[PDB]
Amino acid sequence: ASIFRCRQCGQTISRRDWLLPMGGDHEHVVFNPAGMIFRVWCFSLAQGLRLIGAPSGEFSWFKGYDWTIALCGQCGSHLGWHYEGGSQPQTFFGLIKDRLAEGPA
Template sequence: MPVDKEKDERSSKPREAIFCRACGNAVTSRDEKIAVGGSHAHTFFNPAGIVFELGCFRRAPGCRNAGRPTSEFTWFAGYVWRFARCSNCRAHLGWFFEGRDSTFFGLILANLQE
């Protein structure tokens, strides 16, 4: 059976991990970056006036979601959110957004390290 060398190289190529800045846990990877509303990065503020710069990611296996889904003060119309915490140290890394047809993580870029 012939071997597809190019496929083997792609599958064995290490994904470039993105880590929790607090503990070094692998949270997601560059391959998981996505655009939501036309952009990967967004700047928002919460009701307390704290400003967050978020990056959107398809998956974040190093996160655990916490809290009940809510639409209160959502930054993305049609989505409910829950907190996303580091699965290792429980640091707040951002939010998990769930819409009718899609889900994604909005992670606080200052809390990540590439």
């Protein structure tokens, strides 16, 4: 249980070593304006994603950061968001925990 893959197709996405405790915790539970709840895990790094559109500040869950939707680069599953435009760190990924599968490297 050391890397995270896309639950839908198996694309390699991130690693447990890359987990990032933003504000004290790598886990943040959030809702969007449609009332969907997401359990977001913050990672310093990820791969195999495809970032869509240009960054937006609207309704950002992390103060000072602008977000872009992150899809799985292989299957197009919505895996979370890439955050940028902030400070310490300038950028990071917030990935939806239950859309990943964890397993050996």
